[PDB]
Subunit: 68 residues, 4 copies
């Protein structure tokens, strides 16, 4: 029931409630780094993280949990 | 030479709408320092891009993206290079 | 009246908070962008004061009522 | 040395501000891309610094920040250029 830092990478051109804000940064010509701050139920968190990360094309996925 | 803040709101859920803005963002990547996204409701998502470079090419990526579609509540705050 | 707000301003790095972003725009200056959420009365108030503080420069505010 | 980006995240209750700031900047800096600040409660601030530069310097800077007394949950996620 706390916060979390979900970070992952994906190609920019290749065409909720847990979200607080997300930072986007182009680490190079094709990729962009995305750092999502999540707040809520660690259960709901850890899963939404898994999903995206588990996603195809979603490289460097990392979740840092900070329970309340 | 300079820094700028381009903010604007648009329905996050709009593939077409985003796909444009993106490749429009991707056209002049070298301008972007970092961007922040915040869901302001169920459909609309606030977007704040921090830019750096020629205030010229800046306003260009700006107005371009600004006058993209649906892209509402657009606003640009240029920060001149003479403190 | 609820709503989101974008507060931005400059300064020498020397309750309504959503997330705040900091960026050095030179060895001395720092650009700060604060995303606020809540009662627009308070938001603009909080915003108005910060912008008025000596040392705070180029303060701007874009309100997003809803 | 290897080049890249990195995500330095850490929590602290916002002198130890100036302490961190003395780290952020004076000893190493120009490595910072941008930093996100989020209040996880009345006392604690969650900070996320996106850094870019030589991976070595990035790690030393990160060593100096985490080391700090009072900084908790410090994590460094390196992204050397792929």
């Amino acid at each position: 029931q706390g916060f979390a830092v979900l970070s992952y990478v994906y190609e920019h051109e290749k065409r909720h409630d847990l979200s607080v804000a997300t930072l986007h940064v182009h680490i190079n010509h094709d990729d962009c780094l995305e750092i999502a701050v999540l707040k809520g139920d660690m259960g709901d968190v850890q899963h939404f993280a898994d999903d995206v990360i588990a996603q195809r094309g979603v490289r460097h996925g990392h979740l840092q949990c900070l329970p309340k």
